[PDB]
Each structure stands twice: as C-alpha cells, then as structure tokens.
Design an enzyme around this catalytic site. Structure first.
Site: not given
Lengths: 165, 290, 159
Positions: C52-55, C58
C-alpha cells in the site's frame, strides 16, 4: 501463574537453564536467586527449603536440581509430581542428561515449560502427545495439500497463459 | 573493514533454515548478553515474510518477545504492522495449533497497532472448536486486562455468557480464574447456580472460588446461607488437595469450638495418613499460629 | 527479482494481486503491508511486494530501498486523481538510481471498474512518457481483465 520461574538446575552454583515468565527487573531477582542456589547456604540435606515464605522447591536429581519457586501456600503432592515429572521428562525432551544436549534443545525445553505448565497449572500427560501440539500438528497439512494444490492449478493454467501471452 | 554478521548471512543461505538455526543460537547467545548490532534485521525481514520454517519462526518470534520491541527504532522496528498481516493470517490461520501456538505466544505478545484488528481476529479464533485455542485466549485476555483491558471493554460479561456456552473444564477452570479478577459478581451469580452441582465436579476450578470468597468478608459480610447450604456439602471434602484446603478455608471462615474441632480432626487424620514430613511441619506452623 | 506493486493496496490493488496468486480476491482487510509471493518464470522467481502506498508505508520503505528489478504499477483506472500528484512523488523514484534497474510495466487495472484514460493520456500524466533509460512499453490490465500482459513482461525479463 503459580510460578514466576522455573529454572532447571545443575549443581554448579548455577542452575543449568531458566525461564522468566514475566520480565521487569533484571536477573538480580533471578541473578540473586541463582547466587543463593549455587551457595546452597552450605545447608546439609532436605529436598525442600522454603525460607522467608518462599518456597524454594527443588529436587536433587543427581548433581542436578530441578527448581521451582513460590511464596504463598500450595498442595504438595501435585508439586512433587512435577519435580519428579521433570525427572521423567528430560531424556526425552532434550535427550538424556548433560547440559549440552539440552543446550541444543533449549528451545524444546523452554517450550516444554510453557507447554507443560500454563502458569502453575498442570496441563496434561503424554509426552509424545505433547510433541504433537506444535511443530507437529495436522490441520495445517490438511489445508495445505488441498489449497496449495488448488492454487497450483490456477498457477499451472496460468503457466500456460503466461507462457503464450 | 568487513564483519562476521555477514559471515552468518552466507551460512544461512548455505544451509537454509539449518544454518539459520545455528544463527539463531548464536544470535541468541549474543542476544542473551544483550548485545548485537543491527542489520540482520533486514535479512530477516527479507526472507521471513516470504518464508516458512515454523520452528524457526517460533524461535524468531520468541526472540522478539523476550527481546524488546519498543526498540529504539520506535517503539516498533517500524514494520510491526506490515509483517503481522501474514502472521495475522496465521493467527487467522484456519490451522488451529498454529493459531494456538501463536496465541500462546500472543499471550506473551502485547504489540498494539497489530492488536487492534487482531482483536477481531482473535474473536474469530475463539469460535474454533479447539479448547486449546480458546484457552489460550483466556491467558491472552488476561494479558489485555492489565495492558489494555479497555482495548476490549465489554468483556466480563461476554465471558460470563461465554461460560454459558462452554463446558470444557479446563477452559472453565481458567475462565473462573480470570472471571473473578474481572469481577467476582458474575462468578457469584453462577455460583448460586452451581451450588449443588459442585460436588460432582473436578477440583481445580473449585479451588479458585475458595480464594475469592475470603477477601470480601473482612471488608463486609451478610451473605451466608446460600453459601452454607453448599458449604455443608463441602463438608464431605476428600481429595488431599481438597481436604488440605477444606479444613484450611474453614478456619479462615470460622473458629467456633465446633469449628475448632472440625478442622482439627481433619488434620489429625491427615497427619496420620501423612507421609511427607515437610508437609507435616507446615500444618504445625499453622497450628503454631492457631 | 524484486518486483514492486505499489499504490494503496487495499483497493483491490490487492485484489489484483490475489487474483494472480490464488485466482482469488481481496479476502483480507485492505492491505497496507508487504504481500509476498514468488512467481517463477525464467526461473527468476518474482518477489512481489504488494504494498500500500498508504501513508507510512509509502513513507517508509527504506529497507526496501536496495535495487529494483521489476515494475508493476497496479492502477485504479478510475483513479485519475492521485496520478498527477503521483507524478509529483514519482520523480523521487526517478531521482533514485536503484530505480533505473528495471524494464517495466505500468498496469492499468480497474477498467471495468468505472473506466480508464488514453494509453497515452496516462503516459504523460504520470510522467511515464519521459523514460527511456529503462524501457517503457505500456500494458493495460483491469482487475477483472488483462491479457498479453506477459508480452509486456516477456520483453521485460529478457531486457
């Protein structure tokens, strides 16, 4: 809990292996204990000594002591069984007796404490069976073959899809 | 300029797990001192989410457990959430022992960002037909109750209803132990219920009640009859444990001349029966008090 | 090879993955973390981090800053949202040098799922048009479609 530690002991002034149910402090509780144990307090014989409301429970088994500790009241026999019981278990667990074997099967041995005794509760019987519970299982396998296979099919098929496309 | 950290790294390749095992032991010993300097973390990280080696995982895991984890990296090494998802799966794992083992670990475990949806996860695992797994939750929960009780807040009852669903003595025994620690009241309600049934039953669970009852009276009483009714039944008494306690509790409760006598007898016979001297002395000591 | 699936995973970015892996679909909570599979071809077994390129995730991938070997960008082709913004991020990959050791694939996923852009339209838009010191042929998938993928890939390992 009914035991914050079980430490298996060898004569050396030192307890051959141990495990700390709960950490907080440092060994000095354990370290201090170790020291006292090694010292034995010169005291002659007797497989039990409790002092200052602390049970120091031990069993010489040879040149070895297996030790448990507690402070407030208990029903004895049960206990005994355990010390003894330890004395039944080890050559199975870690192989015979000499520190090393155990040194190799440390993980096995500690695992046995937990396994055997869940916080001062006599969990079962049957050593082999005891093996069984983990790192010896069954379910996982059942699942794996089918599953792995299923996926595998998808994969195989995929190999063709991939292969051509 | 180079180091044996690296020396271990190749070994791992070389063997696989096997070499790694060796590495664990070394690491362990290294760890045992305190001691280590980081970097292998990366390796570990790399291979382990894509790797099995269950035993090794168990070693690994435990290592994590014993060792710190709120590591100067954080808190976490900082991945304490991501890796877990596999583990969570394992924890999810249909594979019951595997979950149970984890759970065992988990009772030892206490790492929060990971816990939260594992709270959900655990809940599912309770349902699994294995008493081992379920029991393991009892410890785990116990672990929560101090650490972040709240994390789950609805529990004491939930348990209590659960007890209703339940029937494995082993688990029950546990259930009690925790339950009173959360709240006695539920146990009591049940106690009322159980009063006749007790006699039929296995000791271990029975024991636990004996402690509880004690603390409350010194603070306040008025409660007796319901108890009494049972208590008299308890004046069967017959396991050496049971008896050992049974007279002991009695005195705690009472000291009427009649009481004095009752307990006394129990001892005297006991003694007579008795063999382990160490034991014998002990009762004296009580007696000495007496 | 280390092959990278990034963007926020839980969207079925992960679906995209699960579909490859078992044939299945997201039967996980939407997944921030490393998802790992090895897929074997040319028996380079491609280790896929579906991340995931979540916070944080990322934000933090430095241990994964090492040296790349394969690129999947799994796409919400309904996203046409974070991509400019992405382009703005993406530069720093470009500004990475590990990042220039992969002949790649952006995968347009989520086509059925709403729509998608000109293959070109996107191409400038993430900033993709501009490369060459890595190959850059383009391949659309969907996440309920995708084929010929492997042509894209074919060239790619065999770069």
């Amino acid at each position: 809990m009914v035991l914050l530690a079980a430490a298996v002991c060898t004569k050396a002034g030192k307890a051959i292996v141990s495990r700390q149910f709960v950490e907080m402090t440092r060994t000095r509780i354990e370290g201090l204990l170790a020291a006292f144990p090694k010292l034995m307090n010169t005291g002659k014989q007797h497989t039990f000594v409790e002092t200052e409301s602390v049970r120091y429970v031990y069993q010489p088994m040879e040149k070895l002591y297996m030790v448990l500790i507690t402070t407030k009241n208990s029903n004895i026999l049960e206990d005994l069984e355990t010390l003894r019981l330890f004395s039944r278990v080890i050559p199975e667990y870690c192989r015979a007796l000499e520190e090393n074997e155990i040194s190799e099967h440390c993980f096995d041995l500690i695992f046995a404490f937990d396994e055997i005794v869940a916080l001062g509760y006599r969990e079962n019987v049957n050593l082999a069976q005891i093996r069984t519970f983990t790192e010896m299982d069954s379910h996982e396998e059942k699942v794996f073959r089918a599953v792995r296979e299923t996926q595998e099919r998808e994969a195989k098929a995929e190999m063709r899809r991939k292969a051509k496309e | 300029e180079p180091p044996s950290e690296i020396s271990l790294k190749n070994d791992l390749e070389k063997g696989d797990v096997k070499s790694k095992t060796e590495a664990l032991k070394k690491v362990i010993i290294m760890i045992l001192n305190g001691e280590k300097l980081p970097g292998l973390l990366m390796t570990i990280i790399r291979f382990v989410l894509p790797l099995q080696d269950h035993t090794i995982k168990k070693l690994l895991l435990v290592f994590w457990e014993i060792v710190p984890k709120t590591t100067p990296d954080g808190r976490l090494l900082h991945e304490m959430i991501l890796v877990c998802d596999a583990y969570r799966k394992d924890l999810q794992h249909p594979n019951e022992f595997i979950r149970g083992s984890t759970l065992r670990f988990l009772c030892k475990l206490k790492e929060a960002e990971l816990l939260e949806p594992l709270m959900p996860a655990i809940r599912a695992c309770l349902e699994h037909r294995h008493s081992y797994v379920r029991r393991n939750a009892v410890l785990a929960i116990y672990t929560i109750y101090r650490n972040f009780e709240h994390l789950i807040p609805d529990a004491p009852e939930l348990i209590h209803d659960f007890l209703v669903n339940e029937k494995d003595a082993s688990c029950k025994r546990n259930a009690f132990m925790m339950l009173i620690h959360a709240d006695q009241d539920r146990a009591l309600d049940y106690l009322s219920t159980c009063i006749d049934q007790v006699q039929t039953f296995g000791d271990i669970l029975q024991l636990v009640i004996v402690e509880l009852i004690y603390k409350v009276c010194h603070a306040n009483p008025s409660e007796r009859a319901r108890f009494i009714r049972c208590i008299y039944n308890l004046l069967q008494s017959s396991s050496p444990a049971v008896k050992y306690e049974a007279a002991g509790t009695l005195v705690t409760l009472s000291s009427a001349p009649t009481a004095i006598k009752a307990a006394a007898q129990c001892y005297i016979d006991l003694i007579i029966k008795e063999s382990d001297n160490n034991v014998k002395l002990i009762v004296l000591d009580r007696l000495v008090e007496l | 090879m280390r092959i990278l699936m990034v963007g926020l995973d839980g969207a079925g970015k992960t679906t995209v993955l699960y579909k490859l892996k078992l044939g299945e679909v997201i039967t996980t909570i939407p997944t921030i973390g490393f998802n790992v599979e090895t897929v074997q071809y040319k028996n380079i077994s491609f280790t896929v981090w579906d991340v995931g390129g979540q916070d944080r995730i990322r934000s933090l991938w430095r241990h994964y800053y090492r040296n790349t070997e394969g690129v999947i960008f799994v796409v919400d082709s309904n996203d046409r949202s974070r991509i400019g913004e992405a382009r703005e991020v993406m530069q720093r990959m470009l500004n990475e040098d590990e990042l220039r050791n992969a002949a790649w694939l952006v995968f347009a996923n989520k086509q059925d799922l709403p729509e998608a852009m000109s293959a070109a339209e996107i191409t400038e838009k993430l900033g993709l048009h501009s490369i060459r010191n890595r190959p850059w042929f383009i391949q659309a998938t969907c996440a309920t479609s995708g084929e010929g993928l492997y042509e894209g890939l074919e060239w790619l390992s065999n770069s």
